[PDB]
Amino acid sequence: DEANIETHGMVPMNRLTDDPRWLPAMSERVTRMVQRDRNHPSVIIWSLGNESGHGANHDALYRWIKSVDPSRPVQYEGGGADTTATDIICPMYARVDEDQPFPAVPKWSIKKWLSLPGETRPLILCEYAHAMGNSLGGFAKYWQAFRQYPRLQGGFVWDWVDQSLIKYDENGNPWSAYGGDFGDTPNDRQFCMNGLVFADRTPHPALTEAKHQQQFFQFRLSGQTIEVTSEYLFRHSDNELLHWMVALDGKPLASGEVPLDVAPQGKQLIELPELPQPESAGQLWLTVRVVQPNATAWSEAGHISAWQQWRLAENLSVTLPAASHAIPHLTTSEMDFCIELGNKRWQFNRQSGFLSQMWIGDKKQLLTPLRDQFTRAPLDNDIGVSEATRIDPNAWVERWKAAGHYQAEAALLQCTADTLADAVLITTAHAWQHQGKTLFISRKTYRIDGSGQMAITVDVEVASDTPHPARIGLNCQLAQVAERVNWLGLGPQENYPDRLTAACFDRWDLPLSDMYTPYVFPSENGLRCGTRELNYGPHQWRGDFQFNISRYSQQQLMETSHRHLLHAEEGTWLNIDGFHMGIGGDDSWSPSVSAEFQLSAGRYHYQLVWCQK
Amino acid sequence: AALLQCTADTLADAVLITTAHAWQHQGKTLFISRKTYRIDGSGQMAITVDVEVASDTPHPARIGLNCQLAQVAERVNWLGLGPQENYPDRLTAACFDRWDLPLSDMYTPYVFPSENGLRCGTRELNYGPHQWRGDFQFNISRYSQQQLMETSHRHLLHAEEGTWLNIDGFHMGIGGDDSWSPSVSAEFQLSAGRYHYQLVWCQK
Amino acid sequence: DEANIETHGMVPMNRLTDDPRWLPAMSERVTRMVQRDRNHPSVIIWSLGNESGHGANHDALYRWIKSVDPSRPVQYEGGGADTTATDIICPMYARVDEDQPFPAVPKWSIKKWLSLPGETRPLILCEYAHAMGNSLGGFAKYWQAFRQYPRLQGGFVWDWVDQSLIKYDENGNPWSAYGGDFGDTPNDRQFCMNGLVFADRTPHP
Ligand SMILES: [Mg+2]
Ligand SMILES: [Mg+2]
């Protein structure tokens, strides 16, 4: 609970608090709270105010709470969260490993706070993990330090529900309004969402990550025994059933159910029976989940609370997919390479050096040719506080715009034609320049198998002065529209290379509209990671990659502002990428992507195989 | 090892020979490797290697290749890091510059004979009439690799004929903070599952 | 500086120390040190012993140093390096990020020592970075934490010089001998080097 004080506008932020002419008007908002809310059993921590500087009055009211009710502690944040007007330390937005110094109000690192000379109090965070748009990246690193150290205690997540308002058009259909669009000046135009769910209510994708790291059971594997440990403090395990399943490539072999009962703060060992070993290639996966059988007051029957996955002993493929008896044929022109095989054929535009048109039928498979891609639509965690009038150089979007990633273009260097005994090999190199400075280098080889599949190998090379690029991959525009998509990898939600601790590796099936996640502010969405097989319509893709298929393009998400003004384009845009950047973050105005997950190797490699039917 | 496949290819300006291998033991397949050989028209050679490691056997030591050259020279010339030795976990001391030394300083005689003398992060290697380009780690020695494992003292080693040369792509940190428990930290182990490297042989 | 006490063989390692029949023979090796080395300006930290368990005698001599010379601190290692017989924490071979638990004598992580409930003293390591053969790997990670945190202070490196002995063959040429090759039983055959330089002297890499 909290009184009603905030003075976040004055210069400096302790003018109306330190001056003692304002003591009567300020001490009628704390006294008349305590006399209203002191019988209830729920409130355990009082708090004075938020973002109002430090002064003498915040020391004056503190003994007034601590002298008329001694059974609860008192918490206060502003001024650095160390002063005499508090009992438990509570910084806002403090990082985990790195630290940043300011004049006169530092924010030290969370492991460094406790070891300063003469410090004994605990530490509960008041605000962490800002959550606008795609966020809650790097969330898993907090919940290792929260369980290893004894004296850290946890934190509070900003914020739960959106703040949107509705408004009607001339058709009668509504659309969610935001910020300063009613007709006021001035405004701030994006900082009103702060969403973990929508305003309906209907859950974001970002919630099911926070469900997983906060679970009440912890599991650990050893040999052939599984170990279950608890995290309750008062309750005995009355209704819990364990549910185990072994899996090979989407085909089940063994399953079972074991009843469970653990003491508080105890341990239990569960012995697994023998499991049959397969003969073909594959990685054996093990999945364990926890199910309640009866209905409580706050849940129905059949609720799920905890899960965990591991990798078991495996076996690797030995034989070779060879061979077939069909031989491809090729022929040349001054604009196009024509490589056919029976019904199916391929064409190569000379000047772009790209795949111009692929054929099944008598049917146009594609419109836009096969091309590399090096960027994304700017999310909220890299737009900063920059706008069209005031600029800021430390944000990511202004550095990329400054160097010229969005503007640069390619120039061709070399394409050669080769004919093997069973295949053909077409080699092509490219380079991207801007204002006379050479940005990026790429070299790729195309191989056309005799069976019917295609083998593509890519070698990219990045200069060391320009800032680090967003993605490394390629995209295209398919012409047919289907109903469902089928991927073999991770699911069922979305996930990024920094937020992937929540999924499990299994087969999944969904229709098309669930892949697009409509945010209120339109940006990039819907990448699936770690997959090994992709199936859509009549087409097939194999390798190790990250992907997203969408109805919408990539440029139109960058240009517009609202979510009700998007229109559907024809065809389906498909985007396949090799290596990708974490999103963070812990603030939204300073960059907060951690250094381990950036893209700074200098050299990279990836391989993929196209296939029909 | 057991061989699987080798094919011969003739381009317009080059030739391409493709070869795959696999290593097994007691009926369980340990390691997989696939490599391509390309012979340029200028005089140089281009070699590309793709290796693949199973996920149950513990993590291997190095990933590379070695050979036995027949001529003996006086000095070696490398372009990269120097002048001492360095490993991928102990490399904060060198600087990136040209260096020149005679042969005997490359072998560091410990009293207990073991592995020694890898140079890391280099970009050019020159010894005698030969030339190697890419991005790699290397050591050239008078001694073999097996005889360092077998014996016990340092005064009982004898010199073999020729020069053994060893070139490696990716390598393991050594630690450590104890000597009875393992102490190599988890960040510098070799657990990706897939790896890639490329190198170019050249004469004169 | 250090007195002359080590009892690393008995079972358990506090038999000859906790039993008070051995107090006179043990308190003639600390008293006659302090009266020999107290005028010099170089010594700044006294130390009782190494690897000898914990008992009552190590609490008994501690006030005897801290009552006849108050101008220097007193350091002691064994038993977990937390007990009442010391003033500055000194674990041996403690790691930096991961930790390993033992029964009854843990070795917690070096950033985790200072944040336990009711702990205020500094921390100087007594032994770190064992150095036989190719070693001193991962050494750079200590010297980031030594400069970021205020209250850590540094450590001591084992060991400086090799312990080799010479012996002659029939040719007259020498070779460095090690361990149990003279003709004794038993032996340990590699743990005598611990080298940062050779025995000449000539520096390691
Ligand atoms: Mg405010
Ligand atoms: Mg000892």
Radius of gyration of chain A: 29 Å
Number of helices of chain A: 9
In terms of quaternary structure, the protein is part of a larger assembly
Largest interface, counted with CB-CB under 8 A? B-C, 26 and 24 residues
Derived from helix and strand composition plus strand pairing, the structural class of chain A reads: mainly beta
Number of domains of chain A: 3
Task: Kindly state the percentage of residues in helix of chain A.
Answer: under 10%
Count the beta strands of chain A.
Answer: 30
Annotated CATH architecture of the largest domain in chain A: Distorted Sandwich
Bound molecules: magnesium ion
The fold-level CATH name of the largest domain in chain A is Beta-galactosidase, Chain A, domain 5
Strand proportion of chain A, as a percent range, falls in: 25-35%
In whole angstroms, the N-to-C terminal distance of chain A is 61 Å
Would you give an account of this structure?
This is part of a larger assembly, with 3 copies of chain A. Chain A is globular, with a radius of gyration of 29 Å. Chain A has 9 helices and 30 strands. The first copy, chain A, folds into 3 domains: 1-214, Alpha-Beta Barrel (TIM Barrel), CATH 3.20.20.80; 215-320, Immunoglobulins (Immunoglobulin-like); 321-613, Beta-galactosidase, Chain A, domain 5, CATH 2.70.98.10. The first copy, chain A, is mainly β and 613 residues long. In chain A, a hairpin with a 5-residue loop joins strand 5 (165-168) and strand 6. Chains in contact: A-B, A-C, B-C. The interface between A and B is medium-sized, with 16 and 16 residues. The structure holds magnesium ion (2 copies).
